[PDB]
């Protein structure tokens, strides 16, 4: 499942 970690989501709208 690549949804969670194929991009960094810790602060993707900061």
């Amino acid at each position, epitope marked *: *499942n*690549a*949804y*969670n970690m*194929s*991009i*960094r989501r*810790s602060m*993707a*709208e900061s």
Partner: antibody, heavy 114, light 111 residues
Framework: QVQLQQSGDELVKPGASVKLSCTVS????????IHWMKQRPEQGLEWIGR????????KYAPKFQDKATMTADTSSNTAYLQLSSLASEDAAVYYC???????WGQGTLVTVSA | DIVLTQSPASLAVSLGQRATISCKAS??????????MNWFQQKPGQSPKLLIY???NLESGIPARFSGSGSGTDFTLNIHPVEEEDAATYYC?????????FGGGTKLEIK
């Protein structure tokens, strides 16, 4: 399954604008960012930016900030990429992607006439 | 921005051998214990296909012949064994810091 269907290839004139689309099926676009990428054979792959269709939030790479405008419509499950004031360096294949960056559209070729 | 450099630019390999492609980032792509490096395969006229995400995770639908290793600035894609269908260009991509960036590609051919 998830499909990203991109709009047809376009021949565009210098100084003109063009708006590309990415119609998503089998996935609610409110559920993830949509990303846009550019590819040229010499300069390779570049990330243009991402849009959050749930709130309209956008983040661009600085080189695309005054060239590209990303929009989206959850009502039609479609994301758009508007390219403005086109010049030769804008000729490229443009891709959309989602599900992180796992699922990609087939690409739209933009060619710029002389 | 993070600059990704692949090595080699082109690789000719014998059917059935192992091959490794290197991707080096100019700054760390690590955050909170994870490494945000992806690997893609692309064949002419087709979109890039995700092979590996977060350095070492095999994408659903991709054969286990592909694996990824590394952390920080240094990453590798390993193909074991190489098969005819593997002829393609391979790209690394970091998604740790905006803007996301891609390596310059490595073109793999069969001898």
């Amino acid at each position: 399954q998830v499909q990203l269907q991109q709009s047809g290839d376009e021949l565009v004139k210098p100084g003109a604008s063009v708006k590309l689309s990415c119609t998503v099926s089998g996935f609610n676009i409110k559920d993830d960012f949509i990303h846009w990428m550019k590819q040229r054979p010499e300069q390779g792959l570049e990330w243009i930016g991402r849009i959050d269709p749930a709130n309209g939030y956008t983040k661009y790479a600085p080189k695309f900030q005054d060239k590209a405008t990303m929009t989206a419509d959850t009502s039609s499950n479609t994301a758009y990429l508007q390219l403005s004031s086109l010049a030769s360096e804008d000729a490229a294949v443009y891709y959309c992607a989602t599900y992180g960056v796992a699922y990609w559209g087939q690409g739209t070729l933009v060619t710029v006439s002389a | 921005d993070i600059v990704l450099t692949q090595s080699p630019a082109s690789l000719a390999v014998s059917l059935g051998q192992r091959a490794t492609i290197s991707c080096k980032a100019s700054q760390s792509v690590d955050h909170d214990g994870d490494s945000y490096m992806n690997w893609f395969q692309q064949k002419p006229g087709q979109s890039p296909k995700l092979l590996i995400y977060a350095a070492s995770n095999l994408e659903s639908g991709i054969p286990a012949r592909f694996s990824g290793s590394g952390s920080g600035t240094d990453f590798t894609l390993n193909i074991h064994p190489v098969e005819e269908e593997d002829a393609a260009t391979y790209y690394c991509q970091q998604t740790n810091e905006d803007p996301y960036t891609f390596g310059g590609g490595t073109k793999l051919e069969i001898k």
